[PDB]
Design a binder for this molecule. Structure first.
Ligand code: SJX
Length: 266
């Protein structure tokens, strides 16, 4: 992480694009290349207790090089502010693309396939995302789908073994994938109406959520395969990329540009 070069000279900061983990995030220009970047600025004096978490997500992002994980460009320290620079993705999150209306099973299967690819990359490298959800899946202007905002080493997306603070593995990402499939179909995860502390004991207590609604059988089975209480019974991502729901419904990522265009008129 660079400490000598001034990030205020190296980047043109523009408008906020969201308050994320610990700090505000900005669209910004890279003065060296005029490429657009995302710039997270975290005040470190104003958030000391979590610095190790910031440090952890920075290191694990730096070890990835995949078309499915958002690129990490480095970090800077000016006075007490840490600047975190990432590739900028102009289509928004999958969550933003849910506002216009409801997704068809083509767009759902397509987003899920690309998530499965990044999940497959991360797990092959013995890495765990730990915070899979529609708000952490970002799309480029051209509909490429990438993962962002890795989770620390709201509970609605948590696998039960994760809540029962029992050390876990990659199969926790498959559970969260399942919840994200529901989120993609219905707009919001199971139990979303309820107080988080109620959810904290419902997830280990209750039977797994199922996808209710007029949705295709292969998609419902997809959710059911992901949402098994016992982790070792969930499919791998590699296995899920061969799942009938994906194979019949998932088209080329380019087709998602229509979905982004709707959200930019709206
Ligand atoms: C709208 N497009 C877009 N394109 C790219 C980005 C990149 C980031 C980003 C994510 C994590 C870290 C990060 C890395 C290490 C440690 C920590 C604490 N944080 C930094 C950044 Cl710069 C971002 O927040 N947003 C906003 C939407 C976030 C939705 N969850 C983006 N939005």
């Amino acid at each position: 992480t660079n400490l000598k070069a001034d990030p205020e000279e190296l980047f043109t900061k523009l408008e906020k694009i969201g308050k994320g983990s610990f700090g505000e995030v900005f669209k910004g220009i890279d003065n060296r290349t005029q490429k657009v970047v995302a710039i997270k600025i975290i005040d470190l004096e104003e958030a000391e207790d979590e610095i190790e978490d910031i440090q952890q997500e920075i290191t694990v992002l730096s070890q990835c090089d995949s078309p499915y994980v958002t690129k990490y460009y480095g970090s800077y320290l000016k006075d007490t502010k840490l600047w975190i620079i990432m590739e900028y993705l102009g289509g928004g999150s999958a969550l933003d693309l849910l506002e216009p209306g409801p997704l068809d099973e083509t767009q759902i299967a397509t987003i899920l396939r690309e998530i499965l690819k990044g999940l497959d990359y991360l797990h092959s490298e013995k890495k765990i995302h730990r915070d899979i959800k529609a708000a952490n899946v970002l799309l480029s202007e051209h509909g490429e789908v990438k993962l962002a905002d890795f989770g620390v080493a709201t509970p609605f997306w948590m696998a039960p073994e994760v809540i029962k603070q029992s050390a876990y593995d990659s199969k926790a990402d498959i559970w969260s994938l399942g919840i994200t499939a529901i989120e993609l179909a219905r707009g919001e995860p199971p139990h979303s109406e309820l107080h988080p502390m109620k959810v904290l004991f419902l997830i280990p207590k209750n039977n797994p959520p199922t996808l209710e609604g007029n949705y295709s059988k292969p998609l419902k089975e997809f959710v059911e395969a992901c949402l098994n209480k016992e982790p070792s019974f969930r499919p791998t991502a590699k296995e899920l990329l061969k799942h009938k729901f994906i194979l019949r419904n998932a088209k080329k990522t380019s087709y998602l540009t229509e979905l982004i265009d709707a959200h930019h008129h709206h």
